[PDB]
Design a protein around this ligand. Structure first.
Ligand SMILES: *C(=N)[C@H](C[C@@H]1CCNC1=O)NC(=O)[C@@H]1[C@@H]2[C@H](CN1C(=O)[C@@H](NC(=O)NC(C)(C)C)C(C)(C)C)C2(C)C
Ligand SMILES: *C(=N)[C@H](C[C@@H]1CCNC1=O)NC(=O)[C@@H]1[C@@H]2[C@H](CN1C(=O)[C@@H](NC(=O)NC(C)(C)C)C(C)(C)C)C2(C)C
Lengths: 306, 306
């Protein structure tokens, strides 16, 4: 029993993290086979950041301007190129610890683990969701750029996020591993702001199922509702609309608990309208939306990885 | 900026986890140098658990009754002994991935990361605190026994917890790595219950400092209080008493924010008496007590490990 915000084990990623220095700027890189991936803004000076011309800035660099350190070993850079917003440094040594991996671009609502790093060294791991406005609510300080987000599927590391910047509201923005930003952000210091965020409805329902599995049943009721009546209520409260795909995704949890999806929606509708009135669910006094249906199954069924 | 429940990177522990089978029971073991540590209840059958005589049960076993698997490799057990509630299996191979480590018995209020495992394989990592009643609020399913809790200090893994059992309230109990239970629990299926829990005051104050560091200041006020007036209020609300040692521990955070400890206690006193009135702190609508002062410093200053 029990329910925690659980991250994937980080060991397979820790062995891929390196330190990248260009000029006075040091951040983190991801070393897979013989390529080191890192944010291209590592090539900017203070002068450059209001409106950098990255093609100009890169043509003025040579391989020896990039210092790559894996622990104490220095890696020799033998080529460099830019793909969208990531720099790719070809090095003379293939990482012997390269895991089986793929690069994936995730959608809003999906969750992943972040390995936060400074100077090429892991500081800590935590779980977070891609918000509907394409930011993440992370925890990052100076020097953290290049830290990556990932999932594990059996034996395969799926990299989905590389950290680039913090927005003035204290939330975070970055790219997939092919260098494309999530959201409408750009890697220059121009005024930018996150859109308004919404609550990820399908995840809130998954977490209410987890609560039932763990014995928290006080919010259940005998009613039911329809998708259209539910979605009309949800939109008043800044909740994402529920689709039939979402209903089907929640199938395994509905079956395990014997509570139909649209029954659970009727409970959520009540919680939105009347509130929780100083009661808690799974130790929280707010409705939680950073667990996916798969996260719940994984943690309430005990899935492992190799 | 940002503040998350952050676990230590798990890589150094993942390489120490193995599978231990005795009879029909399989759980996890910890493989350090040439010794595998695991809960001694692995030697019990269903018949044995109401009142096992572990000395009898162990004398009836031989080395070949214990199957130890590290991935696909089988490890040959060459000796066995019992220390308190842990079994120590001597094996013929020293783990080449043994990190620098020590064994530490922690006190209530301290936090650590748990690497939850099934069949010798890591499922996920999460952070939790040793509660004042010597339980942890973990997330564990069948087969999870032998999963360990740990901290990292520079280059050294400090193991502090091995999982043994779940109590009827859904919380968890286990031992240090020398086999001594935390709390008044025993490894037999007799009626046992956790004492009443209290809230870890020094951690709540640390988390309020984190909130200030991250810009959440609405709960601050101009008042101040004394330790004795504070402790009189705190005891009414099931909060642990505050000591002068606690005040000194909070020194670095007081200095960084310019808010004196006893000033912050006056804010907490107000929060206890009037409540939060539907406002949140660091995204929570409850006062959080599973971050230590060191956890806050580490995460708001960016400490790493090697
Ligand atoms: C990467 N190492 C840091 C990560 C920052 C440090 C504090 N927390 C974080 O997430 N990222 C950067 O240095 C990026 C990079 C230049 C500035 N910047 C920022 O994150 C700034 N934000 C910023 O300028 N935001 C707007 C929306 C563009 C105004 C900063 C340092 C947090 C003020 C560039 C964007 C190229
Ligand atoms: C270890 N693999 C499991 C971990 C359990 C499984 C569900 N979640 C957990 O934390 N632990 C055990 O099998 C221990 C072990 C025998 C039973 N037991 C329990 O955890 C039971 N609890 C129990 O009997 N509790 C009281 C307080 C003693 C009544 C169970 C399976 C959760 C009912 C022994 C204690 C030797």
């Amino acid at each position: 029993s029990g329910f925690r915000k659980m991250a994937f084990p980080s060991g397979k990623v820790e062995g891929c993290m390196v330190q990248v220095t260009c000029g006075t700027t040091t951040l983190n890189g991801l070393w897979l086979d013989d390529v080191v991936y890192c944010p291209r803004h590592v090539i900017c000076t203070s002068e450059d950041m209001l409106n950098p011309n990255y093609e100009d800035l890169l043509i003025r660099k040579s391989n020896h301007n990039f210092l790559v350190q894996a622990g104490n070993v220095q890696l020799r850079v033998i080529g460099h190129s830019m793909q969208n917003c990531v720099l790719k440094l070809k090095v003379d040594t293939a990482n012997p610890k390269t895991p089986k991996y793929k690069f994936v671009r995730i959608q809003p609502g999906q969750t992943f683990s972040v390995l936060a790093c400074y100077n090429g060294s892991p500081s800590g791991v935590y779980q977070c969701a891609m918000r509907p406005n394409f930011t993440i609510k992370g925890s990052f300080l100076n020097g953290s750029c290049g830290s990556v987000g990932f999932n594990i599927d059996y034996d395969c590391v799926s990299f989905c996020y590389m950290h680039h910047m913090e927005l003035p509201t204290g939330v975070h923005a970055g790219t997939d591993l092919e260098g494309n930003f999530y959201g409408p952000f750009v890697d220059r210091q121009t005024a930018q702001a996150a859109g308004t965020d919404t609550t990820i409805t399908v995840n809130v329902l998954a977490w209410l199922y987890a609560a039932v599995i763990n014995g928290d049943r006080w919010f259940l009721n005998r009613f039911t509702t329809t998708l259209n009546d539910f979605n009309l209520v949800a939109m008043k409260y800044n909740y994402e609309p529920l689709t039939q795909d979402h209903v089907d995704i929640l199938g395994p949890l509905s079956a395990q608990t014997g509570i139909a999806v649209l029954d659970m929606c009727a409970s959520l509708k009540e919680l939105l309208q009347n509130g929780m009135n100083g009661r808690t669910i799974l130790g929280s006094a707010l409705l939680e939306d950073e667990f996916t249906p798969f996260d719940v199954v994984r943690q309430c069924s005990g899935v492992t990885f190799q």
